């Protein structure tokens, strides 16, 4: 037996109940009968990977602990057999890097407006009121749906990938803090404003922990229309010295994020209408062979 908190009132639930309307891992798209609520449900098999569980059951304690903070994902509880634990979770639309990849191009700054207050808020929560510092941000991490809700994933929630590395991670200063996520949200919002990630030509891991020290952090470029609030948030968030790069408390006051906190903007249809037109319907187009082998 498992035990739902959803709709607002408390459900003791049989997992055989859920009607599975198949995989999404693994997670599975599952309906709750007794209510209509879509919900996503994580299996965490007894036998499987034990560093992957081991994540999983980090992920779910802290996500069990952030009931309060409506830009992480919510849990709606547990279910206990034998052999599984099935972990009830709030369906989302997509991760930000599906929706970079399906549109080929940008998103729209008023978007990552709304995406930036509710991703630094889900942060700072999770530093001021657990001591987690994610040390994963990046656009597969943040969540939207049709509802317009963009928050921050539990995959990786409780605390890397060489392309959003902070250069402190890379060669500290002083061998012997949140700001290297404070970067990575820099890099990830030039990624989904540009269409293009900023570190591209690179070929292997270490080439972009070359670029990330060596070169000038990566701008939004200048030319495209981005106001100037997000041209300077950007800026800040990749200030190559940590120590002078802000902190969650600093941002939460910076003009970007504090007109967006009451700007309207439907994020809800702009995420429907995306969906829609980047349907993939039909058009299908015969892959090319290789190019035979020639002597030069
Ligand atoms: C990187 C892509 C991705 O995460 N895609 C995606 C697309 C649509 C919904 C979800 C999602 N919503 N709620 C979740 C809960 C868990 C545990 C995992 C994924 C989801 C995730």
Not at 106 to 127: C, D, H, N, S, W
Not at 201 to 227: I, R
Not at 245 to 273: G, M, Q
Request: charged share 25%; net charge positive; glycine share 8%.
């Amino acid at each position: 037996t498992g035990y739902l908190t959803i709709g607002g009132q408390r459900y003791q639930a049989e997992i055989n109940d859920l009607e599975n309307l198949g995989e999404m891992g693994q997670v599975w798209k599952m309906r709750f009968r007794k209510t209509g609520h879509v919900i996503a449900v994580k299996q965490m098999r007894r036998s499987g990977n034990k560093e992957e569980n081991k994540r999983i059951l980090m992920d779910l304690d802290v996500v069990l602990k952030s009931h309060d903070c409506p830009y992480i994902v919510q849990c709606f509880g547990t279910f206990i057999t034998n052999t599984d634990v099935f972990i009830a979770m709030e369906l989302m639309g997509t991760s930000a890097e599906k929706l970079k990849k399906r549109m080929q191009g940008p998103i729209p700054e008023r978007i990552l407006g709304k995406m930036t207050v509710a991703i630094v808020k889900a942060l700072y929560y999770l530093k001021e009121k657990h001591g987690v510092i994610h040390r994963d941000v990046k656009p597969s991490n943040i969540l939207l749906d049709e509802r317009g809700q963009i928050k921050l994933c539990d995959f990786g929630i409780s605390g890397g990938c060489a392309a959003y590395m902070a250069p402190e991670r890379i060669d500290p200063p002083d061998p012997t803090d949140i700001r290297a996520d404070v970067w990575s949200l820099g890099i990830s919002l030039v990624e989904l404003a540009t269409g293009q990630f900023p570190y591209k030509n690179c070929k292997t891991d270490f080439e972009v922990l070359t670029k990330v020290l060596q070169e000038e952090p990566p701008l939004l470029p200048g030319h495209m229309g981005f106001s100037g609030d997000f041209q300077s948030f950007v800026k800040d968030c990749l200030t190559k010295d940590h120590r002078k790069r802000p902190k969650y408390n600093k941002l939460l006051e910076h003009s970007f994020i504090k007109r967006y906190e009451t700007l309207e903007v439907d994020v809800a249809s702009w995420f429907k209408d995306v969906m829609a037109k980047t349907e993939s319907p039909t058009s299908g187009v015969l892959s090319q062979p290789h190019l035979p082998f020639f002597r030069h």
